[PDB]
Paper text:
Here we used a pair of thermophilic/mesophilic acylphosphatases homologues (acylphosphatase from hyperthermophilic archaeon Pyrococcus horikoshii (PhAcP) and human common-type acylphosphatase (HuAcP)) as a model to study how local flexibility of the active site affects the enzymatic activity. Despite remarkable conservation of sequence and structure at the active site, the catalytic activity of the thermophilic PhAcP is significantly poorer as compared with its mesophilic homologue HuAcP at low temperatures. The salt-bridge between the active-site residue Arg-20 and the C-terminal carboxyl group is found only in thermophilic PhAcP but not in mesophilic HuAcP. Taken together, our data suggest that the presence of the salt-bridge between the C-terminal carboxyl group and the active-site arginine residue increases the activation energy that results in a stronger temperature dependency of the enzymatic activity.
To investigate how this salt-bridge affects the enzymatic activity, we need to engineer a variant of PhAcP in which the salt-bridge was disrupted without perturbing the active site. Molecular modeling suggested that the formation of the salt-bridge required the C-terminal residue Gly-91 to adopt an unusual phi angle of ∼180°. Thus, any non-glycine substitutions could disrupt the interaction. We then replaced the Gly-91 by an alanine residue to yield a variant of PhAcP (PhG91A) by site-directed mutagenesis. The substitution did not significantly affect the stability of the enzymes, for the apparent melting temperatures of PhWT (∼107°C) and PhG91A (∼106°C) were similar and there was no significant difference between the values of free energy of unfolding (ΔGu) for PhWT (58±7 kJ mol−1) and PhG91 (51±6 kJ mol−1). Most importantly, the C-terminal alanine residue was confirmed to face away from the active-site arginine residue leading to the disruption of the salt-bridge. PhWT and PhG91A both gave straight lines that intersected at ∼298 K. PhWT had a steeper slope denoting a stronger temperature dependency of the enzymatic activity than PhG91A. In terms of the activation energy (Ea) of the reactions calculated from the slope of the Arrhenius plot, PhWT displayed a greater Ea value (49.1±1.4 kJmol−1) than PhG91A (32.1±1.7 kJmol−1). For example, at lower temperature, e.g. 283 K, PhG91A lacking the salt-bridge retains a significantly greater kcat value than PhWT. In contrast, despite the mtm180° rotamer conformation, transitions to ptt180°, ttp180°, and mtt180° rotamers were prominent in the MD trajectories of PhG91A and HuA99.
Numbering used by the authors:
A (entry chain A), B (entry chain B): 2 to 91
């Protein structure tokens, strides 16, 4: 079943290649959506695809690239909008 | 590789069969550890095993059983201790 998850990731998550890494991981898992850094220092992302794939990426996001230290993730499930491909946005 | 994750799950997470469901899901993925309800209304869990499997379970934990509404998950990575099997504790 196709699901859509809206994430907010906190901790030491910027300046560690998080966006690039999530995109890489997303493509490998086949997840669509986007990711971006917010001015408050957190990371925001939209994941859309098969629940198994999205959940796998959510789990990975709690680890992130080597230098990342995620202390918390807030998820909001929503209705899919037809996202295609995973991109790094502003 | 083997990893250990300490979780704190918040939201509408108790009285929805979360513990039973996480145990079921854990056995299916082959994750070791435990889960339990805390008096402050949150859920606490320890997941240990191959990172791919643990991450999969963490992702699932953001969805949880049908009635569950997870608003936040706090993860803390630690050194594995040799957990074996997944159980529901007090
Ligand atoms: K940061
Ligand atoms: K990390
Ligand atoms: K649910």
């Amino acid at each position: 079943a196709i699901v859509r998850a809206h994430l907010k990731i906190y901790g030491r998550v910027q300046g560690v290649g998080f966006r690039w890494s999530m995109q890489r991981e997303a493509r490998k898992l086949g997840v669509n959506g986007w990711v971006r850094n917010l001015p408050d220092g957190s990371v925001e992302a939209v994941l859309e695809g098969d629940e198994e794939r999205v959940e796998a990426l959510i789990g990975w996001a709690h680890q992130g690239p080597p230098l990342a230290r995620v202390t918390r993730v807030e998820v909001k499930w929503e209705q899919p909008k037809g996202e295609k491909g995973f991109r790094i946005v502003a």
